[PDB]
From a paper:
One peptidoglycan (PG) hydrolase, AtlA, has a predominant role in E. faecalis septum cleavage. atlA mutants are viable but form extremely long chains and are greatly attenuated in the zebrafish virulence model of infection. AtlA is a multimodular N-acetylglucosaminidase belonging to the glycoside hydrolase GH73 family in the CAZy (Carbohydrate-Active enZYmes Database). The enzyme undergoes post-translational modifications (glycosylation and proteolytic cleavage) and preferentially binds to denuded glycan chains (preferentially found at the midcell) via the C-terminal LysM domain.
The structure of the catalytic domain of AtlA (AtlAc) (161 residues) was solved at a resolution of 1.45 Å. It adopts a lysozyme α/β fold with an α-lobe containing five α-helices (α1: 180–197, α2: 202–213; α3: 265–278, α4: 299–306, and α5: 315–327), five helices 310, a small β-hairpin, and a major β-lobe covering the binding site, made of two antiparallel β-strands (β1: 239–248, β2: 251–260) connecting α2 and α3. The structure also contains five glycerol molecules coming from the cryogenic buffer. Only one polypeptide of AtlAc is found in the asymmetric unit, suggesting that the protein is monomeric in solution. The AtlAc active site shows two highly conserved glutamate residues: E212 is equivalent to L. monocytogenes Auto E122 and FlgJSt E184 catalytic residues and is located at a similar position, at the end of helix α1. The second predicted catalytic glutamate, E246, stands on β2 and is equivalent to E156 in L. monocytogenes Auto and E223 in FlgJSt. Unlike Auto and FlgJSt, which show an open groove for the active site, the AtlAc active site shapes into a tunnel. The β-hairpin closing on the α-lobe by forming several hydrogen bonds: E246 OE2 on strand β1 with K232 NZ on a loop between α2 and β1, E246 with T312 OG1 and the water molecule 12 (Wat12), and T312 OG1 with Y247 main chain N. The crystal structure of AtlAc revealed a partial occlusion of the catalytic tunnel by the K232 residue. In AtlAc, the β-hairpin shows a “closed” conformation and the distance between E212 and E246 is 9 Å, which is the distance required for a classic type 2 nucleophile substitution with an inverting mechanism.
Numbering used by the authors: 4 to 165
Amino acid sequence: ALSPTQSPSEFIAELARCAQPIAQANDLYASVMMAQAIVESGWGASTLSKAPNYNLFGIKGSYNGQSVYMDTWEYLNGKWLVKKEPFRKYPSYMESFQDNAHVLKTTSFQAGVYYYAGAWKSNTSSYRDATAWLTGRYATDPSYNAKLNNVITAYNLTQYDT
């Protein structure tokens, strides 16, 4: 299953079935989507990513009012700190994929400016531009793009892009 899974190969094949169509429909890289699920969830092992939360993507805030508070590492002003933060809670694994796409496509702090626009496939030359854009935006980890890129390259995840 996504959890527990027999191998990275299993986990990847199961992610692709959801990620490929959603990424294609939304001008996103499937590879980046799948890397974010692997890195955020720890191959589907995190409590946040498992039932009854199903949040594969470390998405913060609330989903139709549904949230779970969890301890999380943040990198702030040059220090790693544990913070307790609100994460979205979903009814199944599918909504977390849809919501990752929604967050990337629609997040805006200023009129006419989409915060994640640099991770949209049409605004990039390669997936590396998208992972770089997420760093310091989606997550505070200053090595976030290196962690995503390392998963993409190790597992040839651009095979799922189109």
